[PDB]
Design a protein around this nucleic acid. Structure first.
Ligand SMILES: [Zn+2]
Ligand SMILES: [Zn+2]
Ligand SMILES: [Zn+2]
Ligand SMILES: [Zn+2]
Ligand SMILES: [Zn+2]
Ligand SMILES: [Zn+2]
Ligand SMILES: [Zn+2]
Ligand SMILES: [Zn+2]
Ligand SMILES: [Zn+2]
Length: 127
RNA sequence: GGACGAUGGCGAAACUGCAUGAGGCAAUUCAUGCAAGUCCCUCGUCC
C-alpha cells in the first residue's frame, strides 16, 4: 500500500539496530530518494542487484557510534497527499533538515527545488 | 497572504489519477500516452 514508508521504516529500524545495510524491493522512486539521501550525507551508498527482483541495498551511516539519520518521517502518503508551491516549501528554519520533494524535474531536496523555482509533493523529512 | 474568475497558456511531467500494454497475469514492478490532481507562469477582480 505504501512502499515509501517501508523504505523509511527500514532505514529507521536499521539505524536503531546498528545494521550496516538494509535491503528491499527496488523502485525508480526509491532509487530517486536513495540518491538524494546520499548526496546529503544520510547514507554511505545504495546499489541495485538482480533483474527479475531488483533488490535495493542501502549502506547506512554512522558517526563514530551514532546513527546519522536522527529522524525520518513520511509527510505525503496515499491517504493524505501533501503538496507545496515553491514559496510554501520549508523556508530555512530546521537547521539540517532536508525535505525530499518530487517535482516535475525530478526528486530533489527542498533547497534544490527552491533554486529551480518549483514546488511539488513532499515525500518526507530527514534530519 | 487569503477567496475566486480569463478563450487562461500551445508551459513542466517526478509523483497521483485515467487509458493501453508487459510482467506465476496475486506485484512493494515496468513501458507508452493524457494532462484532471500537482507544480510553473500570465491577465483580471474581490477582502
Ligand atoms: Zn496548497
Ligand atoms: Zn504564493
Ligand atoms: Zn498577495
Ligand atoms: Zn492570492
Ligand atoms: Zn485556470
Ligand atoms: Zn507534454
Ligand atoms: Zn493496468
Ligand atoms: Zn508507476
Ligand atoms: Zn508515467
Amino acid at each position: 500500500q505504501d512502499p515509501i514508508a517501508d523504505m523509511l521504516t527500514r532505514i529507521r529500524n536499521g539505524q536503531a539496530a546498528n545494521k550496516a545495510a538494509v535491503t528491499m524491493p527496488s523502485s525508480k522512486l526509491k532509487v530517486a530518494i536513495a540518491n538524494v539521501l546520499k548526496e546529503e550525507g544520510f547514507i554511505e551508498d545504495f546499489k541495485v542487484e538482480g533483474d527479475t527482483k531488483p533488490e535495493l541495498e542501502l549502506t547506512l551511516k554512522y558517526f563514530q557510534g551514532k546513527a546519522v539519520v536522527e529522524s525520518i518521517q513520511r509527510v505525503s502518503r496515499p491517504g493524505l497527499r501533501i503538496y507545496k508551491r515553491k514559496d510554501e516549501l520549508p523556508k530555512v528554519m530546521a537547521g539540517l533538515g532536508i525535505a525530499v520533494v518530487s517535482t516535475s524535474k525530478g526528486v530533489m531536496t527542498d533547497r534544490a527545488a527552491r533554486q529551480a523555482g518549483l514546488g511539488g509533493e513532499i515525500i518526507c523529512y530527514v534530519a
